[PDB]
């Protein structure tokens, strides 16, 4: 199989991760410092977060400029230093790559709201770079996506005399796409990183791309044949290169994104459908909604793969739910009314789950044992905070806490210069949550962490099995089985706070034993009818093979 | 039934919970400040640690006066505030009363280290409180309990010019109690505290009282005899206070302490037996051991009460376990030679544990669900660790870690300035393991310790209940029923780190319901032959109900 079906990522943002000369801001000295922790960790592939020269509006997804580097993270020399230093331990970097959209600090968009013609008389090639109106009433009816902020998708450029089309943050000016001048911009910005041996991209807004009157200005066919020709010039310039999608839909629309056999779009997409209900199903103590919503989810092409995740440094959404789904899980998991934004919750994932352990290694064992490649988000995998105080999503984008020292290690700027301050509090602050603490800990959410997915790498059916989910008899039980080259895993997780009692269908399985992957404890022989009485304790999980 | 079957005890040293007055030593206004910790903990009863005057060669237990306040821990009035702010508050407190042997700086010893007679010819009627012998040969070949510091129990005074008995050290020379004298003094000392309201004693080194020629100097009868007249005093002078007895024996001996229904002794023993076999089962994931050492336990009288612990201020000891069981022990639970002290291992119980919380919560379950009254050692209720550089025992008495500021918020004084220095380490110092930190984190220990107290509470069973164990045909799994006043618990504990599953002889039971003490979550009905099967994750503990 290609490597990214195999791969575990890791997301960090290379402004908060390692800060290498004191500044107080993360750079790509200090990012290369800390490869072998991610390669011990048992990560494949790193994901960053843009890094391009941007007025951070958007914290950089706000670009001025997509052949450099933001001087924050250092030159462009450090950037390939960094590149080589991972490909030299196996590692896979892949970069963010903002197509929707531009900076309105871009030269492009200075250059465009000058006019159509320039003020000696000739036409401004760059105007038609971005989508104007005279009045603004076009693709009315559409949604806004930051509805805590925008109030429109159209704004008025005070210079240029005319509206410009946005779905994200005023400063954010929208590419028009049917200028065929802008698609080969982004082919060459791609081109631009891809020459120096990135592995691929995250693409980013990919739904929003085209605009036409009478749709709601999504997944649009016009838009899908944009993303079918980014794959072709990948595929056909750069073989073995991934090509990840940001697709925030139904599950219905999102399988479009991956394109099909004869006319490929995207090798990966994120599995935002499956996201929000497991945190839904654990606080309904019930798991019927994770099979329902799987079981919606087409079969992908050969060369698709899911990408799995239970946070990111975005809010956790809930646009993608009903009325009825997500009000309860506002009411579970954002008691504070701050904890809202743009239809979702900003949190990080331990204080989502009441910093509870056994909740948190609960839900990274379905994470690493559904069907996908997973992807950790930077700092979960030692149990941090958040900070409300913080405005907009950037409360879970605090900077990385290594040990109890100056602003946990991550600068000696001290933290109020760190530019996100370190957190400090007394039950997710560097003192108390860190790595070199969890490093020399025999117990830690660390060594857990590594110790497990050591375990999933051991058994390709996690990475390429099939799935099948069993019936058990109590909707707290979930159990499923992942099946590929003759290795069958059996995988019953309780999503319940007490002991729970299930009844499994392996009727299949008559006449084979379940034995533990870890320490390969005998389980008794399935007989009989097949019917398989378990108890289970709170949020246990079972991690099991059937023999033959 | 007495107060005591009821209790919840709680094991500190003044010198080493909270300094009131910044001189780096705790003292009781200290304590007296933190007793609402302790109620809101659930703690019944505390059992201070010896607080008498004492140059502290031994921590304490090298007593100089039996009837004054150490100098370091405040007043005898500091005192009398404390017992009525703790009594005030639903608190019980026992003290420990050193039996066996006095400091070598007594002054009883000061007098009879002059000799037989005094320089003017009189008699000296303190020479014969200790045991003296004037060639040291006497008690031939008996057990040294201190090893690695003595060599004899014998020790020549230079200014006697003869030998003296000690078990522990030759700074804490025996008391005579074939003397008659000794025996009034002690009850006498006994006296003056129960006359200022404490609530009863722990009896320290109780087996070693009586020496007799020909035999092991352990559990004579004659020290029976003694100890009968104590409890005679107490029953008819202060009736319904409490005698605790540390007796480190083997069952066979350690129920002889509690005497006869005709002729009774202590109301209380520690339960020595148990408490190494729930860590070398732990190890071996095997509990027939358990079962073995509690089946030799003779049932006990009316009056009387086990006392369950997991740690206290002395060593992890293995004196009471076979050569092959003890060697077992230091392979597992002491890697490192410093680890290890006088037959026995010196470290805190995380520690032992390797941090892990879920088989700390599994032997403070088995610790709560077993026969007797619990006793906590102050600080393990929240993971302290140890400090082995300090010498001897201290190691596991370093001061109590309330808050991340200055020492852990035990004094204003400074680290170094304190009596033993609070762990800074980062794993377990201060920083990341505090009280403060604790009440804040919504699934702290200390969280989890008072929430499975109060579940304890509320089901008398565990404190009064007989006890039954029950066949698993799996020696992982330690299964057993509490039986008290028309209610039974079902208690299966999964002793191995990875899932298991087995088989309950629950014939007895057949047609009762089984359900969760917390939620009263349904477990299949017993039915048929009653042969339960049970499957368990790691370290899991069933609390059951069996609904008649
Ligand atoms: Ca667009
Ligand atoms: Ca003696
Ligand atoms: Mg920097
Ligand atoms: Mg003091």
Redesign the pocket.
């Known amino acids: 199989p290609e490597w990214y079906k195999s791969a575990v990522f890791y997301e960090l943002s290379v402004r908060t991760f390692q800060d290498g000369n004191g500044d107080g801001k993360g750079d790509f000295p200090g990012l290369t410092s800390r490869l072998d922790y991610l390669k011990n960790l048992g990560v494949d592939c790193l994901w960053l977060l843009p890094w391009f020269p941007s007025p951070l509006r958007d914290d950089g997804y706000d670009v001025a400029d997509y052949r450099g580097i933001h001087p924050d993270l250092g030159t462009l020399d450090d950037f390939k230093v960094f590149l080589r230093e991972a490909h030299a331990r196996g590692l896979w970097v892949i970069g963010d790559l903002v ?3 531009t900076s309105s600090d871009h030269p492009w968009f200075q250059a465009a709201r000058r006019g159509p013609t320039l003020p000696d008389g000739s036409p401004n090639e760059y105007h038609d770079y971005y ?1 104007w109106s005279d009045e603004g009433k076009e693709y009315a009816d559409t949604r806004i996506i930051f509805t805590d902020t925008e109030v429109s998708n159209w704004t008025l450029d005070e210079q240029a005399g005319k509206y410009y ?1 946005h ?1 994200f943050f005023a400063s954010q000016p ?4 049917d200028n065929p001048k802008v698609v080969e911009e982004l082919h060459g910005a791609a081109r631009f990183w891809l020459d120096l041996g990135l592995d691929g991209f995250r693409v980013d ?1 990919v739904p ?4 036409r009157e009478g749709t709601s ?1 999504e997944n649009l066919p016009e ?1 899908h044949e944009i993303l079918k020709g980014f794959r072709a010039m990948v595929d056909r310039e750069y073989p073995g290169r991934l090509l990840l999608a940001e697709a925030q839909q139904w599950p219905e629309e999102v399988v479009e994104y991956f394109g099909t056999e004869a006319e490929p779009e995207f090798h990966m997409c994120f599995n935002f459908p499956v996201m929000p209900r497991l945190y839904m199903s654990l606080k309904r103590e019930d798991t019927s909604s994770i099979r329902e919503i799987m079981g919606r989810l087409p079969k992908i092409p050969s060369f698709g793969q899911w990408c799995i995740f239970l946070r990111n440094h975005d809010e956790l959404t809930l646009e993608m739910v009903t009325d009825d789904e997500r009000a309860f899980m506002y009411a579970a998991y954002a008691p504070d009314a701050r904890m809202k934004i743009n239809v979702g919750i900003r949190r990080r994932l331990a204080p989502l789950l009441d910093n509870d352990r056994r909740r948190i290694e609960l839900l990274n064992t379905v994470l690493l044992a559904l069907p996908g490649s997973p992807v950790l988000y930077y700092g979960d995998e030692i149990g941090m905070g958040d900070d409300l105080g913080l405005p907009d999503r950037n409360g879970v984008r605090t900077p990385m806490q290594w040990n109890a020292g100056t602003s946990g290690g991550f600068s000696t700027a001290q933290p109020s210069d760190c530019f996100f301050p370190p957190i400090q509090d007394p039950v997710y602050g560097f003192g108390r949550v860190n790595v070199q603490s969890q490093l020399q800990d025999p117990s830690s959410l660390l060594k857990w962490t590594a110790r497990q997915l050591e375990l999933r790498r051991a058994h390709p059916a996690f990475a390429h099995g099939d799935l099948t989910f069993i019936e058990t008899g109590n909707p707290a039980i979930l159990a499923f089985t992942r099946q590929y080259d003759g290795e069958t895993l059996l995988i019953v997780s309780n999503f319940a706070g007490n002991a729970q009692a299930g009844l499994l269908d392996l009727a299949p399985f008559v006449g084979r034993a379940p034995v533990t992957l870890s320490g390969a404890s005998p389980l008794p022989v399935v007989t009989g009818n097949g019917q398989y009485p378990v108890v289970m304790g709170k949020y246990d999980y079972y991690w099991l093979r059937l023999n033959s």
Chains 1, 2 share one sequence.
């Open positions: 197509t929707n959209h989508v089309w779905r929208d590419l028009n796409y807004a929003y791309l085209i605009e200005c838009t």
